[PDB]
Design a protein around this nucleic acid. Structure first.
Lengths: 70, 91, 178, 117
RNA sequence: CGCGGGGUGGAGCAGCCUGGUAGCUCGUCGGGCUCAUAACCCGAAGAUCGUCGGUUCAAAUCCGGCCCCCGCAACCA
RNA sequence: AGGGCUACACACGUGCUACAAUGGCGCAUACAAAGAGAAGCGACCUCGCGAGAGCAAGCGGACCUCAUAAAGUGCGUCGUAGUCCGGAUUGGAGUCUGCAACUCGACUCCAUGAAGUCGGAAUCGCUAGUAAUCGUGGAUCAGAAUGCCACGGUGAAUACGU
RNA sequence: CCUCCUAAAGAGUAACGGAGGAGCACGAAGGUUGGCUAAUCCUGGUCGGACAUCAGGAGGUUAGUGCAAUGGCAUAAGCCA
């Protein structure tokens, strides 16, 4: 041992308990827990013909016609 | 991206070969021109021999491939490579 | 530091009980950790060795020894010898101090990580911790856009098997690969 | 003051600065600054560390940048591994969204190069 | 059979000394213009220094062996 | 019926839009002409992140609607750093035209995010409502316009001399 | 002229016999005291994974040696302070 070269401890030993002000005290997922496939499997998940949202007014089960109005 | 808008697809065209094939689970390659048709859960484990305009290509249908149409796994065009020109079509 | 007195208190007794050893002396203690930072190149320029020192400094403030090839006859470029690693030896209390910063502050630093198999231990229960980057202990404006400069952290042992080898830093929670 | 560190661009408008933690473009950063009580046109050097905390929490739910840039990579690789036409066009670099090959290969495949005839 | 000089990108040269950097002039191939050729203009390809071996971090260079082209050589008469 | 004319190695003809700050961004504001729409297109309405949607007055076109025409006007905003210009690629979803969206269709949107800083050889029109430049409608038109045709806004240097 | 050999284990003995090498270099490239270990391949690895240093095994000084060859080599004429 080279006793004399050892640095001061000013920024080593201090505060291993620090907060989240720009960055975390432990990271998740850096061990990669699944390999990312980047796919959802469409029509296996979700529906073969789409969500029906937007323009909700009761539907008419009786025939209606673009030319039929005057 | 593009989609099938709002109405219900199995393909009308493919339906009459498939309903008799699912009854067996899977049977010999279904001679298909219907490259207009998408892949679905009912179709997992079938073998669709898919006309590409020139000839049929067997698509083995399976769960990892349900995000796709049948027409995508069977090629159409030929691409001239550019080291030196492409000699062949590739299946 | 606290690390080794803990390693005595907790781990040395585990291994005595678990292996049914014939001596207390058969137990590992922590032996010197040299490190490498095998940076390479800069055969006269020695500039990437000063760039290696600004990475090493964040985690351990001590003076680089800056290695030269020891017979200097290999298939690498030879001209006025060749610079290779950096050292920074950890020994005795300064290493017992360093291992107590590892886990607690080393884990929040890495975000994309593939090193450190626990099966990869062999022979002596020797190991080298290929961390892929610098494990920065607390500092101001350390992140600045930079590259590379992981180091071997070459832990050594008075261990005489692999199983007793992999058992350092185990009452310390690290997510080691399988 | 850096938004999250590791790679953030120094002295950028407040809107622009969050376009490097990823999962946060202009739209989401605009609304996130209005929430936190920050004006758009300040340079990032003007914020105290507790504004930087109010930003960092609202970011921390979204995808971390290492997986974001990995995700487009694994999507391209997924498609080549199926051999579907998305993937076939990927092998050469050629358009996947229907665009022409007679011109405008440049964006995917780079500058034009000379070819003897 | 000896003795001595010589062996550069497709062609003709530059570089040459314990050696590091491939340079000049053409020609070549793609393209433009011209009604066409052309010169002209833009872009591009091209070197295991005759061959083999030795020393070195680096060999056209400095060294060992050989093949081949030429001069000498084909006696002292 | 499927594939294809819109391939791709590249080079070339042509047009567009950009390369800025005379501008782009945001919120707020103004007036056209001319024409198409009773297979059709459509206010108000409520729904939808937006696209769009269903409901439905209406519209034969000087009526109602595409359409709030844009450039232009107000104010703050940005500083040459490929940006605060430009916004292409590509991951992914939401929506549209259609008994079919994969190679070769239309629209919104989220994240990520490049070339280009006035361009070699080459290369053309213009004498004034022209040249230049913005937006609009329409023929074609199931689904695709940078094109073409026409309309209107704003609108230039100079023509000594043979 | 040196080193290996012909050369006949003292005497190192010819030949336009066979082969490699030398015409100096270094003011440290000398002296002394004290401590010390490699070519090479594998496993650990961020870039040394193929080659390298660090650390572990195998081998056990086969590297090195001002320069040719011979002898030499842990006492280390090898390497360092």
């Amino acid at each position: 041992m080279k006793k004399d070269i050892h640095p001061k401890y000013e920024e080593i030993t201090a505060s291993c308990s620090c907060g989240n002000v720009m960055k975390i005290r432990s990271t998740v997922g850096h061990d990669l827990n699944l390999d990312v496939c980047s796919k959802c499997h469409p029509f296996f998940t979700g529906k073969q013909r789409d969500v029906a949202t937007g323009g909700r007014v009761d539907r008419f089960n009786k025939r209606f016609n673009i030319p039929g109005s005057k | 991206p593009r989609s099938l808008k709002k109405g219900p697809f199995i393909d009308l065209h493919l339906l009459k070969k498939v309903e008799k094939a699912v009854e067996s689970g899977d049977k010999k390659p279904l001679r298909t021109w219907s490259r207009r048709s998408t892949i679905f859960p009912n179709m997992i484990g079938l073998t669709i021999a898919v006309h590409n305009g020139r000839q049929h290509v067997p698509v083995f249908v399976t769960d990892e491939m349900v995000g796709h149409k049948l027409g995508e796994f069977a090629p159409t065009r030929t691409y001239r490579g550019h080291a030196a020109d492409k000699k062949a079509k590739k299946k | 530091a606290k690390l080794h007195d803990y390693y005595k208190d907790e781990v040395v007794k585990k291994l005595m009980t678990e292996f049914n050893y014939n001596s207390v002396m058969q137990v590992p203690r922590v032996e010197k950790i040299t490190l490498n930072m095998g940076v390479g190149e800069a055969i006269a320029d020695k500039k990437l060795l000063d760039n290696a020192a600004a990475d090493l400094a964040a985690i351990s403030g001590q003076k680089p020894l800056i290695t030269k090839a020891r017979k200097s006859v290999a298939g690498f470029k030879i001209r006025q010898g060749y610079p290779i690693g950096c050292k920074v030896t950890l020994r005795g209390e300064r290493m017992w101090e360093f291992f107590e910063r590892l886990i607690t502050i080393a884990v929040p630093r890495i975000r994309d990580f593939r090193g450190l198999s626990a099966k990869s231990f062999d022979g002596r229960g020797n190991y080298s911790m290929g961390v892929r980057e610098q494990i920065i202990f607390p500092e101001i404006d350390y992140d600045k856009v930079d590259r590379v400069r992981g180091l071997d952290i070459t832990i050594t042992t008075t261990a005489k098997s692999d199983e007793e080898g992999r058992a350092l830093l185990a009452a310390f929670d690290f997510p080691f690969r399988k | 003051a850096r938004i999250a560190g590791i790679n953030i661009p120094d002295h950028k408008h407040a809107v622009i600065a969050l376009t490097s933690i990823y999962g946060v473009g202009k739209t989401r950063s605009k609304a996130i600054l209005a929430a936190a009580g920050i004006a758009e046109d300040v340079k990032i050097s003007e914020l105290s560390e507790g504004q930087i905390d109010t930003l960092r929490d609202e970011v921390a739910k979204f995808v971390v940048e290492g997986d974001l840039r990995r995700e487009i990579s694994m999507s391209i690789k997924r498609l080549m591994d199926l051999g579907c036409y998305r993937g076939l066009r990927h092998r050469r670099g050629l358009p996947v969204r229907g665009q022409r090959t007679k011109t405008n290969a440049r964006t995917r495949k780079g500058p034009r190069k000379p070819i003897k005839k």
